[PDB]
Structure 1
Amino acid sequence: SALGKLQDVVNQNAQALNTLVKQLSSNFGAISSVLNDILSRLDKVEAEV
Structure 2
Amino acid sequence: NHNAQALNTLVKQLSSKFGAISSVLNDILSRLDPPEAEVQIDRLITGR
Fold-level match, TM-score > 0.5?
Answer: yes
Q: Which runs of 5+ in 2 are unaligned?
A: 40-48
Structure-1-length-normalised TM-score: 0.77
Task: State the 4+ residue runs in structure 1 displaced beyond 3 angstroms.
Answer: none
| RMSD (Å) for aligned C-alpha atoms | 0.4
Q: Which runs of 5+ in 1 are unaligned?
A: 1-10
Structure-2-length-normalised TM-score: 0.78
The structure with the largest helix share of the pair is 2
Q: Which has the larger radius of gyration?
A: 1
Letter in 1 for 2:8: N
